[PDB]
Design a protein around this ligand. Sequence first.
Ligand SMILES: [Cl-]
Ligand SMILES: [Cl-]
Ligand SMILES: [Cl-]
Length: 163
Amino acid sequence: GAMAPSYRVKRMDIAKNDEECVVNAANPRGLPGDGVCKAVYKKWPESFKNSATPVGTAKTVMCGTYPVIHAVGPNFSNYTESEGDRELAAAYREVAKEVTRLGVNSVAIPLLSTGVYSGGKDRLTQSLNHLFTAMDSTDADVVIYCRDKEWEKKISEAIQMRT
Ligand SMILES: [Cl-]
Ligand SMILES: [Cl-]
Ligand SMILES: [Cl-]
């Protein structure tokens, strides 16, 4: 575990992270995809061997000794608000189990279902609160990755609010 487990946020490409493992915002079929998933495919393509997994689950595949945790959030274009919320919470719970099992001291994580799976809605708060619910009981250093300057400020404020 980390000496003083923390949350941090950075605005940059998660493929350039400084953590001991990465969470991919994956599709259920293990395809290269777009956005975070395509950057993850270009950096760790070996990790997409048998990475397909259902919605609300996470599947870890090694790239050398570097773990890639493929976490599949719901696409809110297809799910109801109610069922999507349940699947989004579940995907983060499975990420917490994988991070624990791997024994890593740090993890890079994107906000699941906030991009092309958002169904056109701002889900910063919804996705971040499910991230916290899952990861609060883990002792890894968590570094959240985002691309938007306004999202960086709101995520940083939410972390600081809990002190
Ligand atoms: Cl960057
Ligand atoms: Cl997404
Ligand atoms: Cl973002």
